Paper text:
We have previously found that the Ab25 binds with both Fabs to two different epitopes on the M protein, so-called dual-Fab cis binding. The data obtained by protein cross-linking mass spectrometry was supported by experimental validation showing that the single Fabs of Ab25 IgG1 could barely bind to M protein compared to F(ab’)2 fragments. In this work, we generated all four human subclasses of Ab25 and observed that the IgG3 subclass had reduced binding to M1 protein compared to the other subclasses. In addition, our in silico data suggested that IgG3’s weaker binding to M1 protein was due to a loss of Hbond formation between Fab1 (binding to C domain) of IgG3 and the antigen. For the MD simulations analyzed across all three IgG-M1 systems the binding of Fab2 to the M1 was stable for all three antibodies, while the Fab1 showed a transient behavior and was most stable for IgG1. To better understand the binding stability of both Fabs across all MD trajectories, we extracted the network of hydrogen bonds (Hbond) and salt bridges at the interface between the Fab domain of IgGs and the M1 protein. This analysis revealed two stable salt bridges (E44-K58; E46-K65) formed between the VH domain in Fab2 of both IgG1 and IgG3 and the M1 protein. Moreover, we recorded a set of eight Hbonds for the Fab1 domain of IgG1, whereas only two Hbonds were observed for the Fab1 domain of IgG3 and IgGh62. The analysis of H-bond showed that IgG1’s Fab1 has 6 amino acid residues forming H-bonds with M1 (D54, R56, D222, S249, N313 and S314), while only 1 was formed for IgG3 (R87) and 2 for the designed IgGh62 (S123 and K127). The differences between IgG3 and IgG1 in Fab1 could explain the reduced binding of IgG3 to M1 measured previously. Nonetheless, our analysis suggests that the network of atomic interactions between the antigen and antibody Fabs can be altered when exchanging from IgG1 to IgG3 constant domain.
Author numbering:
A (entry chain H): 1 to 137, 144 to 224
B (entry chain L): 1 to 214
Write the structure that this text describes.
Amino acid sequence: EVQLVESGGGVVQPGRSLRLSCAASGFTFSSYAMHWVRQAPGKGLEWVALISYDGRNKYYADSVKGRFTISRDNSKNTLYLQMNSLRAEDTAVYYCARSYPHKRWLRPPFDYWGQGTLVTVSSASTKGPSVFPLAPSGTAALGCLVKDYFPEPVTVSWNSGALTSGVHTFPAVLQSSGLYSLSSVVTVPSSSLGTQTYICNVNHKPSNTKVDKKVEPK
Amino acid sequence: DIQMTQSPSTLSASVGDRVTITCRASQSISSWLAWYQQKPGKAPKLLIYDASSLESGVPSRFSGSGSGTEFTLTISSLQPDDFASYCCQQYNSYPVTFGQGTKVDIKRTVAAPSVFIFPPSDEQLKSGTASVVCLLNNFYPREAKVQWKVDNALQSGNSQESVTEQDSKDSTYSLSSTLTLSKADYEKHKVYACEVTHQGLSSPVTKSFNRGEC
């Protein structure tokens, strides 16, 4: 029952530090070379670093050399990635991966991975969103625009979770300003407008912002 | 580092289909190539290593082939669990490298988008900013072009869009496009239009509003 569980990801500003952990279970961790691999938004997987079974040999990708340090605690079945001097381009999901057993640890396939932990490096600062109605103008669409917030994520529900069918909450896009913007829409029977009230419930926990915006015909 | 080029970027398939994804290497990697399966929020999974060997317990409907510089992953009788992304990896030489990935989505009949346009709210115009939203609802396939027009003037560089994941029940997508202008420039013009082209439409659909006089 091999399992790898990464933790420690978060949102920081350029130049700062983050320590990632990966807890391993279900195998003799101390007999395997271990790796970190990362995947930036909309890009391919990129190998970052590796460490030998006994922690004596470590190798690093050129893009992180001198800024990251891979390490391991074999008595705790844990692998670590300490980052400092982080850059925007270090933003990625970071994966812990096991080196294929009898394959050269320097260039192996990886037979087990974790679910990953997300690292976000940005000069933006925490900010709650503005929520604006997308007013409906026999099927009618309406929604809420969740603009200018940082960092991810926000959650949007409709009618406190009572309204689920026909709801589409879109992935946020990152604007020029460095802030996110998201839209959430729902289609309803034109004839229901005025009968049901429609409320997007918006929550951005990083800024402790909760907004309930009611959407009216204009 | 060895560059790995995967093709195609995406493909659609039905259950029972035979699906082929290729990966090419900038220099031969002999047979040192692995294939992985990736699903959102889950751990990557090793399917095939050494170009052709299946990992223990991997279903035999997966096969791998190739040697040198060109490589093939084939899923022969695709099953519902196989809708996912797939990436190759070389381990011939030290910095291991991966392809960009290939997404396999569910095939269905063509479905035209229902299009809606939303003017900026008066509360937003207060801020000094105008966001105009165009919604393309429940269409297939994923490929769609959204074109913003302001008093017939083609817009470029001032819009962003995002697309949902394929819907579990009806296998469609929806798309949101946002056009951003200053409040000053929004008030300079009258007609805001999003023109949508898609396979489900015999001809492009335009939805518009007239800023004033409404």
